[PDB]
Design a protein around this nucleic acid. Structure first.
Lengths: 56, 117, 76, 91, 151
RNA sequence: AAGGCGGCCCCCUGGACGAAGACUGACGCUCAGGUGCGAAAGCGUGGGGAGCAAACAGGAUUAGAUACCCUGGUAGUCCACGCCGUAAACGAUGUCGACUUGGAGGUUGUGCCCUUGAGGCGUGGCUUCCGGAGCUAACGCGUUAAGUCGACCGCCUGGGGAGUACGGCCGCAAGGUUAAAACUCAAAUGAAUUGACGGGGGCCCGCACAAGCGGUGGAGCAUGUGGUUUAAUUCGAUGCAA
RNA sequence: CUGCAUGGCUGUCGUCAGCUCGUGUUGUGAAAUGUUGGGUUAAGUCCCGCAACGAGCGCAACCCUUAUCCUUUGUUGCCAG
RNA sequence: CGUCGUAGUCCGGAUUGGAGUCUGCAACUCGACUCCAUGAAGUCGGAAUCGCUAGUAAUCGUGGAUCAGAAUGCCACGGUG
RNA sequence: CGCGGGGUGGAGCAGCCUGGUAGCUCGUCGGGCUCAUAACCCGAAGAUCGUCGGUUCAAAUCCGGCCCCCGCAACCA
């Protein structure tokens, strides 16, 4: 998520863009995911569970 | 003592703390301030407000060179990712570019165990 | 052990000793802070109750690390 | 200086459990603290004739090497009795 | 307020100036339902502040209130065993209430001879943005800017 | 096949599936004993060693804290060649074959259609979620059966004792495999039900928290209780609910 | 004396939203459904949905009081002309 | 309206001395109240903790039951709010 | 006459060469958490810093005596 402010665009709008670029890019989610070791069995467990919830 | 007018704000925002460093394009350190060393400890150290005064204190130990434009390099997930950037812009700074540079391994090193608190 | 440094110091004037032991005399806290800054060192209040309070110019982090190192090593 | 740290020896703390934390209590003393034993009887102002002074006395007697005790107190205050233990004093 | 949201009682305006705002003020200064004696102290303080400080009684009030008004604050919160401090942007109506409330409280915690003189000197101090009440706004911001990361 | 297998490229190699037709001619299914494979940890020799981390040390927490948290950190985790042969090694469901209504998807072949659109109509392999009859103690399973049948194998016979002892075989070791009895109990167990409970989970309420205003905890006195005292300080009320 | 033999009375979760029955249906059975769901209510309140259809206790209503008014009655209450 | 002018005070009233009132056969142990004198602690209370969502909280008086006499408790009443 | 290290609150310490209201632990008494207790948490009590003379602005910490405890020492058949 690289951003370049355009002319006569307020610092705020550019910022809001930037934060949404990272929301889009999944940075913090990604960093959260890797802060700590997850066992393979555990991430397979996570994967099934979300497949399941993704039925409405 | 010297002149730059064109810089880059590298902000390291970890969960426990947020270090702000101002630099030229070359990557040479012009000035720095941290939250933990601006009168904030533990529970207060890890706040956006502490990161803000860090950005403020840093803009005072750099305007000796009279920077006038800069880019921002946001690293890490903590507070002061964003609030630090704000303080810079209000301190009298034109923001050219914003970039997240938080490192992402392509799954390399095994991280520490989960904390069972 | 712990000393207050730099802006934590409240004394209006202090007697200043530099990193090499040179007695710089009585200086305003402001001037003492300037001298420390130009040398990229810290202004450390080593004698809070002296008259006037005594400050030494030194690298506080390096000093503190060595002190803790010393204590730890001598006990293990 | 010499700090006060503490250990406890409850009833049902025998050899097993006990001298493991006589090891813990060495540790306290051996930091150079004055290690205060607190008994905590299932009991009263005279709980025991057993609970306390087996334990306490054998804690002294085992630790006697490194530590000695200030007093063998045997005056309980409440439902609990402090035996006070210190570094063994250099004369 | 688990389920039932509500409106708010829309108190009568100040009898003398016809200001709802000053009605929020006399009430906040009021104690033991002594309305009669509460507005007496607010006016004499406004009269003391008005007479000998450039007049414009309502405006004088605002100059002082403008200064203790807080733009942001923190709301305590307990997540994963942790008491995090989340800085919240606070709404205009309450902004006045905190502003008024800290001015009143700083006035009673004062050395002067009566509440009216105290109130007057608190407003004056606030008008020049100094004293306890302004300082209450600043701690709120120092505390807020610190936890800027978690907004 | 199971264990398990994930950056990209090449080389060597196993299996599966489809289309068409030719060939062999029941050459098939199952399998005690036997043989081979078989996560992780562990073992032996020699390499390798960033990160992680049993052990261990130090800092904290705590009544204690040989833990949970923090700062370090050895074996190990990695490679080669050997060993070990065990897991909730699980679908807790042996293998093979035949038969029995349906709906929505995923994946992967293949025949047809102005290919005239990212399609239209068929036909195989695997797979996910529902569900019909039937089955089932119920939960649930339901053409990938736990339905309807047949062929062959393995295994069970109340709980504890015990996957223990003894013997045999196996292993450098740790240990594995086969596998009892005395003794003791009238239970142990499965699924589901109504409550109660939760610092297991979800949803939701109450001045429960949050937002506020005023208090109690300090002081003096009133008052009740405990305790202590007394000849007696009469009996009762004692967590929220004295 | 025993509230650890009792009647009567009372606290309490808590004015919390619960507790049940007949017939029907499901399960070999204990039992289930109804009263598993989606909304919304102070509420098992109500509405849709529903192998259940209905019903009873509790919720609510009927009771006291308070807020506006009308008729009746004016003494010891009242005093507009 | 006047006074006190931030003080251990013209704040606070505990405690004690002296002298009295009334109830009641009887106020030593132990009643309530009055007059004079006395003028403690207390300058807003650590850890912790309670009540209250509106005519409520807070604050101000008023009455009753029990009762010869003995309310800061209890039950009830309205004022400001 | 003979060495060591210490004397601070009920017990044990820190504050030391770096001389300006003595703070930190266990106990003590309360409060909080719990249905309750243990445990834990918020707190208050608690002192000539051994005792004196020196010495100083003010010395806990500054020196030396009196004195006490321990240390090993000395009685180690």
């Amino acid at each position: 998520p690289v951003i370049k402010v355009r002319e006569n665009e307020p610092f705020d709008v550019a910022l809001r863009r930037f934060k949404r670029s990272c929301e889009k890019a999944g940075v913090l989610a990604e960093v959260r995911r890797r802060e700590f070791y997850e066992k393979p069995t555990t991430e397979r467990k996570r994967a099934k569970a979300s497949a399941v919830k993704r039925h409405a | 003592r010297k002149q730059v007018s064109d810089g880059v704000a590298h902000i390291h925002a970890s969960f426990n703390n947020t270090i702000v460093t101002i630099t030229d394009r070359q990557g040479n350190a012009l000035g720095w301030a941290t939250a933990g060393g601006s009168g904030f400890r533990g529970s207060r150290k890890s706040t956006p407000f502490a990161a803000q005064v860090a950005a403020e204190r840093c803009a005072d130990a750099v305007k000796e060179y009279g920077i006038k434009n800069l880019e921002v390099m946001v690293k890490g997930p903590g507070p002061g990712r964003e609030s630090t950037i704000r303080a810079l812009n209000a301190a009298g700074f034109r923001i050219t570019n914003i970039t997240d540079v938080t490192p992402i391994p392509h799954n390399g090193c095994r991280p520490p165990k989960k904390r069972r608190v | 052990k712990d000393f207050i440094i730099n802006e934590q110091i409240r004394a209006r004037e202090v007697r200043l000793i530099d990193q090499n032991g040179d007695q710089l005399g009585i200086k305003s806290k402001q001037e003492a802070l300037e001298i420390a800054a130009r040398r990229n060192l810290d202004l450390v209040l080593v004698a809070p109750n002296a008259k006037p309070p005594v400050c030494r110019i030194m690298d506080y982090g390096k000093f503190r690390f060595e002190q803790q190192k010393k204590e730890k090593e001598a006990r293990k | 200086v010499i700090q006060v740290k503490e250990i406890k020896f409850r009833p049902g703390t025998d050899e097993g459990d006990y001298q493991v934390k006589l090891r813990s209590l060495i540790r306290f003393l051996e930091e150079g603290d004055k290690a205060k034993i607190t008994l905590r009887f299932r009991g009263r102002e005279m709980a025991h004739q057993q609970i306390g002074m087996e334990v306490l006395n054998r804690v002294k007697d085992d630790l006697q090497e490194l530590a000695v005790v200030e007093s063998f107190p045997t005056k309980i205050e409440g439902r609990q009795m402090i035996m006070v233990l210190a570094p063994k004093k250099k004369q | 307020p688990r389920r039932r949201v509500i409106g708010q009682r829309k108190i009568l305006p100040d009898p003398k100036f016809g200001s709802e705002l000053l009605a929020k003020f006399v009430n906040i200064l009021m104690v033991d339902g002594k309305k009669s004696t509460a507005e007496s102290i607010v006016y004499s303080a406004l009269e003391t502040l008005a007479q000998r400080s450039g007049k414009s009684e309502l405006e004088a009030f605002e100059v002082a209130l403008e200064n203790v008004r807080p733009t942001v604050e923190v709301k305590s919160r307990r997540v994963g065993g942790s008491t995090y401090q989340v800085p919240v942007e606070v709404r205009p109506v309450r902004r006045n209430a905190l502003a008024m409330r800290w001015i009143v409280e700083a006035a009673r915690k004062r050395g002067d001879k009566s509440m009216a003189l105290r109130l007057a000197n608190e407003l004056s101090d606030a008008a020049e943005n100094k004293g306890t009440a302004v300082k209450k706004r600043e701690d709120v911001h120092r505390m807020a800017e610190a936890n800027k990361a978690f907004a």
